[PDB]
Amino acid sequence: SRIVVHTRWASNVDFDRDSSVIMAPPTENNIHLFKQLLNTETLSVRGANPLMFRANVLHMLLEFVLDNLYLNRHTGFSQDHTPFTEGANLRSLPGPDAEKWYSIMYPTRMGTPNVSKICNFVASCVRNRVGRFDRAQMMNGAMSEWVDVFETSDALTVSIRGRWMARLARMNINPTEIEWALTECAQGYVTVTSPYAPSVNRLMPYRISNAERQISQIIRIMNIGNNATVIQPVLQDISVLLQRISPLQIDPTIISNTMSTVSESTTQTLSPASSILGKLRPSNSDFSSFRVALAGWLYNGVVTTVIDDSSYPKDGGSVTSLENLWDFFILALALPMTTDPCAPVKAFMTLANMMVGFETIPMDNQIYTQSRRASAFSTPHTWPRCFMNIQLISPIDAPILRQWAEIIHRYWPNPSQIRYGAPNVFGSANLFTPPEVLLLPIDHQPANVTTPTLDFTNELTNWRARVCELMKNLVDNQRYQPGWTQSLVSSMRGTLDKLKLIKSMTPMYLQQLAPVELAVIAPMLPFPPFQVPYVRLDRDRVPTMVGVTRQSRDAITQPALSLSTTNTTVGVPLALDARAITVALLSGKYPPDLVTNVWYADAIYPMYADTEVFSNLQRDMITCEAVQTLVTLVAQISDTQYPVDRYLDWIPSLRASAATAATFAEWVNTSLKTAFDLSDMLLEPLLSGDPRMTQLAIQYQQYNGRTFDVIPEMPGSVIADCVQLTAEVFNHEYNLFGIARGDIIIGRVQSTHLWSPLAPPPDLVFDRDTPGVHIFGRDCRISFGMNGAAPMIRDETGMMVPFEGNWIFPLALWQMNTRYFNQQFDAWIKTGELRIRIEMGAYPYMLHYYDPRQYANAWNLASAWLEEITPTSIPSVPFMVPISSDHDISSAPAVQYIISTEYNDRSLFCTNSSSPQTIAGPDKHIPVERYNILTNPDAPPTQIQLPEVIDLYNVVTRYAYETPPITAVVMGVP
Amino acid sequence: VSRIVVHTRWASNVDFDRDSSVIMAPPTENNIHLFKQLLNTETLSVRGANPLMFRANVLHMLLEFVLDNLYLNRHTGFSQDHTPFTEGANLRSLPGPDAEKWYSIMYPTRMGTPNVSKICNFVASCVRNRVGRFDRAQMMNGAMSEWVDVFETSDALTVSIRGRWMARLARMNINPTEIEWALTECAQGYVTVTSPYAPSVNRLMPYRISNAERQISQIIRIMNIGNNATVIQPVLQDISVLLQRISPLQIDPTIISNTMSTLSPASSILGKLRPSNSDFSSFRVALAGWLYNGVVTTVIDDSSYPKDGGSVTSLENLWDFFILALALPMTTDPCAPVKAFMTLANMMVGFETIPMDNQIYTQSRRASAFSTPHTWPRCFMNIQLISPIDAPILRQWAEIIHRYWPNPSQIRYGAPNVFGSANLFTPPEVLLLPIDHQPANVTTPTLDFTNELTNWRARVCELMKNLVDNQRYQPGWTQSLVSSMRGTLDKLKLIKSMTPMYLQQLAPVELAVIAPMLPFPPFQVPYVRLDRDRVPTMVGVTRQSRDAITQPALSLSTTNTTVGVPLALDARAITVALLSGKYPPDLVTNVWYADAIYPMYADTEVFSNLQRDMITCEAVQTLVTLVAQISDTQYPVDRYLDWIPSLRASAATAATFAEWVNTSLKTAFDLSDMLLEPLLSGDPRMTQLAIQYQQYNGRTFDVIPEMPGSVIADCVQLTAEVFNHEYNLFGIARGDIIIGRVQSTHLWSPLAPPPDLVFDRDTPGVHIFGRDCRISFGMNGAAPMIRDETGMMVPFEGNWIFPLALWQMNTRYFNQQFDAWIKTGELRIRIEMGAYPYMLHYYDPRQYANAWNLASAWLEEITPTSIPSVPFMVPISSDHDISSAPAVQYIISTEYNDRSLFCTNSSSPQTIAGPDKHIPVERYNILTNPDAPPTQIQLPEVIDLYNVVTRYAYETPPITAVVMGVP
C-alpha cells in the first residue's frame, strides 16, 4: 500500500503462500520488513545490518517476484457515460464500490469541483488511450483468451506473468493425445474414459524433457542417500497394492498339499511330515509378506535383496540328515529369487557345506573351505575360483557335485525386460539404460488364458525338477544307510515324487501373469525407482560404486578430479525369508475370477482418484527450477569462486561466507517450500554440505573397471531472469527503498529555511576538498581531559587534538569502539563544532514529518537513538521533516543535526491532491512521469522500454481461459 | 683521641633493606674482617689475609658498599628556629627525635664558639650564611621539595651514586594514560579503567625498556632448565588450573550414554570409559601444549595403540583407531599424519598392497619406530604412485590427509610499545596457533560443518563405514551388523558437542588474553604440515664466546624427535572433550568473562619479571666487564689494581665471586628465589651467547643478541681511582717495611718515622739473597755467616733483600733463624708488600709491655697463603709533655701516610706533647671560601664532607587500578 506498489489491489486473487512484501507508513518512519527479515548485527522494531545487506535485499526482491503467479480471469466490461469518457470501457466487476476501483484504476470519476492543477490536467488528457483497447477474442459467449486495457499498475508484473505463462503453457498439447501415453501406462488394458478434443486452451503443462527428469533423479538419489528405513513401509504399501490384486488362498491350501504330498516314515527315522509340520507352522492366520521380494525387484543397483540369517542352518552342513534336505530344497528354490550376484557361488558353497566330510576336492583358501558361511562371501574375489573354474572340480571325488554345478551352469533363470509409459511426454525412466527399458530378473512368457490352469512349463519348474533329481541321486547313498534305515529312503522318494508333482498355480502366474501386473502401476511410483543392467556370470561386470558429484575437490575446483572424492554409498542389504516363498511356489491357489481386462482395470480405477504423478511432475519441475536458480545466485553478488557480474557492491555489505550463504539459502528454501506448501526434502541435502563448489554428475563402474558417466543439465530459471532485470532497474530507484546512497554529515546546524537535509542547499556540505578537514582513517584513541586540555583524540599519527572542526571517519573504526565514541561526543557535536562525515555508503533511514510553525530540534536524543545500536551495525536514520508550504508561512527555528551527504529525496504518497494551491500542506504535484501517454499516444506499451521508460498505467492483459484440474479428467474404465 | 666514622647506613630514613655491609672497621676495634669477608675461603681466625687474592678480592669488597645505597628518599618538614649561632636559617625539620643533636651532626654552626677549641676557634671562622636550607624545588609535597639542596654534612659519593641511579630510574617512568592504553591492549580491549582525578606529579611508573633484556632472560632461563621437565610441568599445572578454573563450557560423556540409551558398541565404549571419572586436567594440558613448542613435543602412549599393531577384524582395534584418529590432529608431533597413515596400514597389512622404499621399514613396523624426517616415504610424498588397485582405500585416505588436515594461523598479542616483547624466531607481537581462528558471537548453536572438527568427524565416519561395508576386508564377520555398527557411526557423527565451538573461536580468545600474563613468555616453533625438508632440525645456542672459532653449545635437537620434550596424553579424556560439550544453559559470553577476569588481573606480578630481567642484564654486563678487569681472556683486558700484586686468573675464582654477587643481590631484593646460574649455566671464560635453528633442508636461521651499557662498572672506576689517588683510607697501604731493632725517644708513629732511620731498598750495605742462598755456620759455635751472590759469608746485619719467593715457602724457619738477631741486634731487611692490611696497638707513652711478643705472634700467624694486618703500638699525643719512651722498634713501614687522621686531642682544645692534628677545614672550603659552587671541580681531589643535598618528594605508587574484564 501507500506508496501503493504492494499487491492485493484490484485483481482476481486466488490463493497466497505468504509472499508478504509490503511497505511501511510514510507519514513517519518506513522499513516495510527489516525488523522482521534480517537483523544479524542490528536489533529493533526499527533496525537492520549492513554486514548482511545483500542477502536480505535480494531475498526481499525474490519473494516479491514469487507473490505474483495468480490466475487472471477477466469477466466483463461496459462502455461508460461520464463526461469524462468518450467510450473507454470500464471493467465490470461485482465488487463493492467498483466505482472507487475505477476512479482508482482510472483517473475517471474525478469531478469538476473547482479549478485545480489536477482538474486542469484532467480536462487536457486523452479520451482513448484509456480503458479497453484490444483482445484475443475468436470465440463466442466466452471472454477473449486475454484482454488488453489501459489500467494502472507496474508492467513488470505484466511481463512477470508473461514469462510465467511462457514457462507454463510451453507444455500443452491437444489433450486426448495423452490418452495414448495413459493407455501405454494403462498397458492398453486399463481402459480409459475421457472426452474427444484437440487443444481448447485448457493448458496441460506436463510435456516434460529428460533434463529435469534426470535432475530430479539426482536429487532423489541423495534424498534417498542413507535413509532406507523409509523404503520398507512403502514397499509394504506395494505389497498391499498387490494384495488388492492377488487371488491366492494360503493356509489350508498348503495344509492339504503337505498332508497329501509326503510319504510315510513314521517308524522310519524322523517322518518327513512331522518334521516339516514342526518346521513350517500351522499358524493359520493372515500371511501376506510374500510380496516383499517382488516389490523390491524395482531396485538392483539401488538395493540388495539378501536373505535372512536363520534361513540357513548353522551346522557346517553334512550328509546323514533330514532337516538338511528340507532346508537345502528350500534354498535351492529361494536363491533364484535373490538379486545378489554371488548367490550362484553362495548356493555352490552351500551344497559344499552339506558336502562337508564326504566328497572333498580342491579347496583354495581357509575361507573357500566348505565349512564357511556362503552368505559371508561378498566379493568376486570372495568366490571360490573353482566355482567359476569348473575344471578344478574333479568328477572323481565330487561326481554328484560336478553334476549339480554343471546343471546350474546350463540351468539357471535369466533376465528380460518390458516397456511402459512414454518419454514422448515424460522423459526417461532410468538413466543407466534406454528409456522405458524395464529389465527383469526373469524371462516373462506370454500368458493366453484368462483363467488359471495346470502346467509344468517354467524355468523354475525345471529347476525344481533338477533339484528333486539330485536329491534322489543322493539320499539313496550307501553312507545314508548306516546312518539310517532303508525303507526310509523308499518313503523318501515316495515323498519327493509328489513333491516335484505338487499342485501350484504359482509359477504360471509368476512367469506370465505377474510381469504385466508389475507393469500395471508402474510409473505411478512416488519415488521413481532405479535399476541397473543384469549380471548372471562374468564377475568383471560386478559394479564398483556410484559416485555422485555435486561439488568439487578440496584443492581442485574441477569436477573431473574430485570425482573420486565426491562419491556416496551404493546398495543396501535387505534380508528376507524363504518360508512364505516356497509356501507360495509349491502352491498357487487362484480362483478363475481375475478377468484381466475386467478385473484389474476394475481393481484400479477407484484407487485412481488423485494421480500423484501430477504432483510428482510439478514436484520435480519446480524442484529443478529452484536448483538452477540456486546454482546461479551462488555466483553473483554472493560470489562462490568465479567472479562474474556482481551488481550491488557499491552497497557495502560483508563478503561471502558459506555461513552467510547457508543463512540466505535457508530463507530461500523456506520461501520455496511455501510457494506450494512444499513439505519434503528440498535442497536440504544441498546445504547438507557446502553448495559452494557445485558440480553435478554421477557415475557407476564395474569389476572390469568400466566407468559410466551421466552429466545433468538445466535450462535456467525464469525467476532468475526477471529478478536480475528488476535488480538492474533498481539501482536508480533506491530512493524508494528507505536505503540511501552516500553518507551523512553530522553537526548541530540551525536553519529555518524549508529545505530537505535529503537535499540541503550547497553551502551546508563539506568534503575532503573542504579545508578544516581532520582526516581520520583507523587510528583514533582518545585521552580524557588533560591538565588544561579537554579529552583529546589520539590522531591517525598519534597526536592529541580537541573535539571540533571538520573531520572524516570511515565507519569500521567507529563500529570498533562505538561506546567510547558515543560517551564522548555528546556536547562537542551537539553543542560544539565537531562535524564529521561518518562514511557508510548505503544505509537505511526513516522519518517523521512536523509542523514547521514551532521550533525544531534534530537532536531529540538522536544520540540516544544511535547508542541503541551495536558495535556490530548501525541504526536506521530517523528524520523530522517540516511541512513546507507552497507559499507564505511564518518563521520558526530548526536545529538540525544530521543531513544527507547528497540529494536523494524521492519518495512520497500523495498529499493534497485536489487544489492548485494550499496554505502550508505537503507541496505535491501530480506525479507526471507515468501518464505522459495521457497527453500523447506513444511509448510502445509492450516493447522493452525500462528503465528508459517507466510508467504505472499501461498495457493490461487480464486473461480468461478454461482451467480444469487434471486429476478430474482422470476418468477410468474398470 | 678518636678517628673518623667513614660510614653510611646509620640514619635510615626508610625501612628498605640491602644487607650491604657499609661498616668501616675501627682501629680501637679490628680492621681485617672487612678484608676477611671477600672471595677468600682459606681464612680461619680474627686475623690474617691471603696475598695471592689481594687484588682479586678488592673488587667485590668495594662493590658491596655500593650495593647499599640505592634506597629511596622522602619528604622532610620545615624547622624555623634560631639561636645566636643559628640566627635566620630554615633548618630541615625532622619528625625524628634529638634531630637537633643530629643537626649539630649536620649543622656545624649549630654548636657555638664561646672559648678556645680547634672547633671553637675555626667555627668562629664559619659563617651562618652558607648553613642550613639552600634552595628548593617548586616541585614539592607537604613541607619538602621533590629535590631540595640544603647546606649539610654529606659525602659526594652517595650523591653521585643515587644521581646516576635516579637518572636510570626516571629514564623509565610511564604515563598512566598510555598505561591504561596498554592495559587495554593487554586486555585486548576487555579492561575498563579510567582516571578522572586530581593530578599528582610525585607519582612514578618507571618500567619502559627494550626487548634484548627479556630475550636474554628467556635464553638464560632455558639454559638453567638445561632440559629439565620438572621445571615446566608445574607451569602447565598452573595453566590447566586457571583454565579449568575459567572455562564455562561443560563436559558430559553421560550425554552420549543417553544418546546411546544404555561387544555391542555401547557396552564396548561403556567399559572403555569408566563412568566414574571426576578429573579433567591432562586434557587442558594437551591444550597448553600449543603455547610452547620450541622445547616440547606432544606425543601419545601406544597403550592406546593396538600394540602399535592392530588388525582388520578386532572390534576393539576399531574403537581404538577410531579414538586416536580423532584425538590426533591437534597434536604437535610433526610425524603424526603419516604415523596414523602407517598405523592404519599396519593393521591393514595383508589385504591392500602398496610399494615401499626401505627394507628396514616395514608396512607393519612400529610408527613409534618411525619418528624421523627420514622415516618419510616418497609414496606418502607421491600418491600418484598409488594405483587405485594397490590400495584405493589408502589412496583416498592420504588425500583426506592432504585436504582436511588442520592448518595454523596467528594473532597479535603483548604490549611491545613500552615494555617490549621477547621473540626471535618471530616478531615479538606475533602469536602462532597450530590451527586457524575465527570471529566472535558463538551464542548460536554449536553446529558447524565448516568446522574442521565436524569436518574431521564427518570424513572419519565416512572412511570407516566405507571400509567396514564390504564384509570381506573383515572376513569371519557373519551377522549383519551393518545396521548396528553403521547406524551407531551415524548417531555418533550426530552427537553435538559445544566444545569445538570453544576451540574454534573461544580458546583463541582465552589464550590471547593469557599471553601478556605470562611470567614466562612462550617458546614455540614455526608450524608447518608438509615439506620434511622445511621440517625444523636444530635448535642450537653457543654457550661459548664467539670471538674465537667456537662451536655452539650441544643441543638435544639431534637426539630428540625434532626439537621438543616428549609429552604423551590420554586419548580417552581428549576425545571425550571432543565428543561431549555443552555450554552453560543461560550463557552470555562477556559478563561471564568479565567476572572471571576481575580479581585475577586485580593481581599482577610481571613487574617482578621486569626488575628481575633488567637487573639481570645490567649484572651480567658489569660482570663480564669486571672480568675484563681481573685478568687475561681471549680478548684484550684492562686491570688496574695490578699495582696490588696478584697473579692471572682461574675460573673458580670468579665462580666464588659470581655466587657472591648472586647471593648478595638476592638478599638485597628479598627476591631470594634464584635468578642466575652464571657459569652454572655459562662457562668459565665465555663472552657471548647466540642462538640458531635450522630445518631438514638445511635452512638455518641464526640470531645474535646485543649489549647496552652499565654504569655500575663506571662508578666502580670512579671510586677506585679516587682511592687510587687518595689511598690508605680503609686498611690497606702501599709500600713496604723495614725490619730491625732501632729505638728512640723522639716520638712519632712508624707511619711517620723520620727518613733517617730508613734506607732505600738495596741501599749501600746491600745484602741480596736469592731463593738458593744457604748458610755457612760459624766455626766451633761461632757466628754463622751467609753466602753472597758472590759467595761472601756475612753475619746477620746490614740491609737485606727478600723480594718474595722463599719466605713465602719458608716462613717459620726464617722466623726461628732471625728472631734474636732482629730482637737484640741490627738486622735491617726490607720486605716487599705492595698493598697490604695493617693494624694498631693503643698504648700510653708512659708504660710498656713487650710488643715483640705480639709482633712475634703476628709473625707466627703467617702462611704463604696468608698475612695478618700488621699491628702498631700507637701512643698518646698530649697537651702536656710526659716521660718519653726508649721505644724499641722492630718493624716499620717504608713510607709516611695519612689514612684518616682527623684531629688531635679528641676534645682537648690544645695539644703540646706528641704530634698535632687540626681539622681538615680543607674539605669545607665553601665554609672557608664560599666562592665555590657545589658542582665545583674538586674530584678526584679531596672529598668534602659537607654539601647542599637535593631531597625528594616524588612518589612511587604500587601499580593497581579499578577495572572490569570482558564486559
SS3 annotation, A553-609: CCCCCCHHHHCCCCCCCCCCEEEECCHHHHHHHCCCCCCCCCCHHHHHHHHHCCCCC
Q: Are A500 and A448 in contact (CB under 8 A)?
A: no
Query: Distance between CA A652 and CA A639 in Å, rounded?
Result: 15
Distance from CA of A554 to the nearest CA of B (A): 6
- For residue A709, give the H/E element and its range: strand A707-710
Residue type at position A253: T
Q: Which of B7, B41, B46, B45 is nearest to B23 (CA)?
A: B7
Q: List Cα–Cα distances, A211 to A115, A612, A623, A624, A632, in angstroms.
A: 64, 20, 12, 9, 17
DSSP string, B651-711: HHHHHHHHHHHHHHHHHHHT--S----TTTSS-TT-----EEEEETT--EEEE-------H
Domain boundaries, chain B: 212-602, 732-898
Q: Who contacts A735 (Cβ-Cβ below 8 Å, separation ≥6)?
A: A904, A905, A906, A907
- Residues paired with residue A806 on neighbouring β-strands, in sequence order: A773, A835
Counts of helices then strands in chain B (DSSP H, E): 25, 23
Q: Who contacts A419 (Cβ-Cβ below 8 Å, separation ≥6)?
A: A436, A437, A438, A519
> Residues of A with CB below 8 A from B177's CB?
783
Q: List Cα–Cα distances, B235 to B231, B242, B290, B569, B611, in angstroms.
A: 8, 11, 13, 17, 21
3-state secondary structure B530-553: CCCCCCEEEEEECCCCCCCCCCCE
Instruction: Give the dihedral sign, CA B236/B239/B240/B241.
Output: positive
Query: Distance between CA A697 and CA A217 in Å, rounded?
Result: 11
Query: Distance between CA A345 and CA A409 in Å, rounded?
Result: 11
Query: Distance between CA B363 and CA B441 in Å, rounded?
Result: 47
B514 is written with which cell numbers?
593469557
Q: Which of A862, A961, A227 is nearest to A568 (CA)?
A: A227
- If you ran DSSP here, which 8-state letter would residue B203 be given? B
Q: Are B555 and B287 in contact (CB under 8 A)?
A: no
- Residues paired with residue A844 on neighbouring β-strands, in sequence order: A739
Residue type at position A906: R
Q: Who contacts A309 (Cβ-Cβ below 8 Å, separation ≥6)?
A: A375, A575, B478, B479, B480
Residue A124 backbone dihedrals phi, psi, to 5 degrees: -95, -20
Q: Are A439 and A534 in contact (CB under 8 A)?
A: yes
Q: Which of B967, B952, B845, B949 is nearest to B158 (CA)?
A: B949
Angle of CA points A9, A11, A16, to nearest 5°? 85
Q: Are B299 and B334 in contact (CB under 8 A)?
A: no
- For residue B735, give the H/E element and its range: strand B732-743
Residues A58-61: contacts with CB under 8 Å, at least 24 apart = A58/A633, A58/A637, A58/A638, A58/A664, A58/A723, A58/A727, A59/A664, A59/A667, A59/A668, A59/A671, A60/A21, A60/A33, A61/A723, A61/A726, A61/A727, A61/A730
**Which SS3 state, helix, strand or coil, does residue B357 take?**
coil
Query: Distance between CA B128 and CA B144 in Å, rounded?
Result: 22
Q: In this structure, how many other beta carbons lie within 10 angstroms of the beta carbon of residue A370?
A: 23
Q: Which residues of A287-311 are buried (b: 16+ CB within 10 A; e: fewer)?
A: beebbbbbbbbbbbbbbbbbbeeeb
CB spacing of A378 vs B472 below 8 angstroms: yes
A724 is written with which cell numbers?
536480475
Distance from CA of B938 to the nearest CA of A (A): 43
End-to-end CA distance of chain A: 54
Q: Which of B721, B726, B733 is nearest to B833 (CA)?
A: B733
Q: List Cα–Cα distances, A593 to A257, A451, A597, in angstroms.
A: 22, 7, 11
Q: Who contacts B141 (Cβ-Cβ below 8 Å, separation ≥6)?
A: B75, B202, B953, B954, B955
- For residue A292, give the H/E element and its range: helix A291-296
- Residues paired with residue A549 on neighbouring β-strands, in sequence order: A697
Instruction: Give the dihedral sign, CA A867/A870/A873/A877.
Output: negative
Indicate which of B175, B177, B183 best probes the interface with A, i.e. most A CBs within 10 Å of its own CB.
B177
In sequence order, which ranges of A476-505 are alpha helices (DSSP H)?
486-500
Q: Are A152 and A952 in contact (CB under 8 A)?
A: yes
Radius of gyration of chain A, Cα coordinates, nearest whole angstrom: 40
- Residues paired with residue A134 on neighbouring β-strands, in sequence order: A148
Angle of CA points B328, B332, B338, to nearest 5°? 60
Q: Where do the DSSP E strands lie in A350-505?
A: 416-418, 438-440
Q: Angle, to 10 degrees, between the axis of helix B651-669 and the axis of helix B54-66?
A: 10
Which residue from A376, A659, A690 is facing B477, i.e. has the nearest CB?
Answer: A376
Residue A544 backbone dihedrals phi, psi, to 5 degrees: -110, -60
> Residues of A with CB below 8 A from B482's CB?
573
Residues B861-866: contacts with CB under 8 Å, at least 24 apart = B861/B45, B861/B47, B861/B48, B862/B48, B862/B811, B863/B811, B864/B51, B864/B808, B864/B809, B864/B811, B865/B42, B865/B50, B865/B51, B865/B52, B866/B42, B866/B43, B866/B48, B866/B49, B866/B50, B866/B51
A659 touches B at CB < 8 Å: yes
Indicate which of A564, A779, A821 best probes the interface with B, i.e. most B CBs within 10 Å of its own CB.
A564
Q: Are B78 and B90 in contact (CB under 8 A)?
A: yes
Residue B599 backbone dihedrals phi, psi, to 5 degrees: -75, -20
Q: Which of B457, B469, B528 is nearest to B495 (CA)?
A: B457
A377 touches B at CB < 8 Å: yes
What is the total residue count of chain A? 974
Residue B623 backbone dihedrals phi, psi, to 5 degrees: -60, -65
Q: Who contacts A300 (Cβ-Cβ below 8 Å, separation ≥6)?
A: A339, A441, A531, A532, A534
A367 touches B at CB < 8 Å: yes
CA-based nearest residue in chain A for residue B199:
A787
B450 touches A at CB < 8 Å: yes
Residue B492 backbone dihedrals phi, psi, to 5 degrees: -65, -40
Give the residue carrying C-alpha cell 637426539.
Answer: B559
Q: ω into residue B337 within 30 of 0, thus cis?
A: no
A655 touches B at CB < 8 Å: no
> Residues of A with CB below 8 A from B439's CB?
none
**Which SS3 state, helix, strand or coil, does residue A678 take?**
coil
- For residue B767, give the H/E element and its range: strand B766-768
Distance from CA of A565 to the nearest CA of B (A): 8
CA-based nearest residue in chain A for residue B184:
A781
Query: Distance between CA B484 and CA A796 in Å, rounded?
Result: 64
Experimental determination approach used = cryo-EM
- Residues paired with residue A698 on neighbouring β-strands, in sequence order: A548, A710
Radius of gyration of chain B, Cα coordinates, nearest whole angstrom: 40
Q: Are A467 and A332 in contact (CB under 8 A)?
A: yes
Query: Distance between CA A208 and CA A173 in Å, rounded?
Result: 12
- For residue B234, give the H/E element and its range: helix B229-246
Q: Who contacts A857 (Cβ-Cβ below 8 Å, separation ≥6)?
A: A894, A895, A897
Query: Distance between CA B887 and CA B845 in Å, rounded?
Result: 9
Q: Are A117 and A925 in contact (CB under 8 A)?
A: yes
- For residue B393, give the H/E element and its range: helix B392-404
B477 touches A at CB < 8 Å: yes
Q: In this structure, how many other beta carbons lie within 10 angstroms of the beta carbon of residue A953?
A: 20
3-state secondary structure A828-885: HHHCCCEEEEEEEEEEEECCEEECCCCCEECCCCHHHHHHCCCCCCCECECCEEECCC
Longest Cα–Cα distance of chain B, Å, equals 130
Q: Which of A524, A580, A608, A513 is nearest to A246 (CA)?
A: A513
Q: ω into residue A408 within 30 of 0, thus cis?
A: no
Q: Angle, to 10 degrees, between the axis of helix A343-354 and the axis of helix A399-410?
A: 160
Query: Distance between CA B131 and CA B153 in Å, rounded?
Result: 10
A658 is written with which cell numbers?
558459506
**Which SS3 state, helix, strand or coil, does residue A95 take?**
coil
Q: Which of B685, B663, B686, B690 is nearest to B675 (CA)?
A: B663
A665 is written with which cell numbers?
539459502
Q: Are strands B409-412 and B691-695 parallel, antiparallel or unpaired?
A: unpaired
A770 is written with which cell numbers?
573542504
B284 is written with which cell numbers?
587442558
**What is B212-602's CATH number?**
3.90.1830.10
> Residues of B with CB below 8 A from A555's CB?
402-403
Give the residue carrying C-alpha cell 553312507.
Answer: A479
Query: Distance between CA B275 and CA A267 in Å, rounded?
Result: 61
Q: Which residues of A388-426 are buried (b: 16+ CB within 10 A; e: fewer)?
A: beeeebeeeebebbbebbeebeeeebeeebbebbbbebb
A177 is written with which cell numbers?
493425445
Q: What share of chain A is helix, strand, coil (3-state, %, to 5)?
A: 35, 15, 55
Give the residue carrying C-alpha cell 483482445.
Answer: A135
**Torsion from C-alpha of B15, B17, B19, B22, nearest 10 degrees:** -70
- How far does CA B24 lie from the centroid of its chain? 29
In sequence order, which ranges of B299-391 are alpha helices (DSSP H)?
315-327, 336-348
Q: What share of chain B is helix, strand, coil (3-state, %, to 5)?
A: 35, 10, 55
Q: Angle, to 10 degrees, between the axis of helix B452-469 and the axis of helix B392-404?
A: 180
Query: Distance between CA B131 and CA B115 in Å, rounded?
Result: 21
Q: Are strands A848-850 and A880-882 parallel, antiparallel or unpaired?
A: parallel
Query: Distance between CA B940 and CA B717 in Å, rounded?
Result: 11
CB spacing of B396 vs A564 below 8 angstroms: yes
Q: Which of A487, A495, A379, A510 is nearest to A440 (CA)?
A: A510
**Which SS3 state, helix, strand or coil, does residue A417 take?**
strand
CA-based nearest residue in chain A for residue B389:
A705
End-to-end CA distance of chain B: 74
Q: Are B396 and B463 in contact (CB under 8 A)?
A: yes
Give the residue carrying C-alpha cell 547313498.
Answer: A477
What is the total residue count of chain B? 967
CB spacing of A689 vs B449 below 8 angstroms: yes
Q: Where do the DSSP E strands lie in A768-847?
A: 773-775, 781-783, 792-794, 800-801, 805-810, 834-844
Q: List Cα–Cα distances, B683 to B226, B651, B655, in angstroms.
A: 14, 9, 10
CB spacing of B472 vs A555 below 8 angstroms: no
CB spacing of B475 vs A367 below 8 angstroms: yes
The number of C-alpha atoms within 13 Å of B58 and in the hemisphere containing its C-beta is: 28
A645 touches B at CB < 8 Å: no
Q: Are A532 and A545 in contact (CB under 8 A)?
A: no
Q: List Cα–Cα distances, A188 to A973, B260, B264, B292, B774, in angstroms.
A: 11, 54, 55, 80, 150
Q: Are A551 and A566 in contact (CB under 8 A)?
A: yes
**Torsion from C-alpha of B160, B164, B166, B169, nearest 10 degrees:** -160
Query: Distance between CA A491 and CA B679 in Å, rounded?
Result: 106
Query: Distance between CA A591 and CA A589 in Å, rounded?
Result: 7
CB spacing of B471 vs A378 below 8 angstroms: yes
Q: Angle, to 10 degrees, between the axis of helix A272-279 and the axis of helix A486-500?
A: 60
Longest Cα–Cα distance of chain A, Å, equals 131
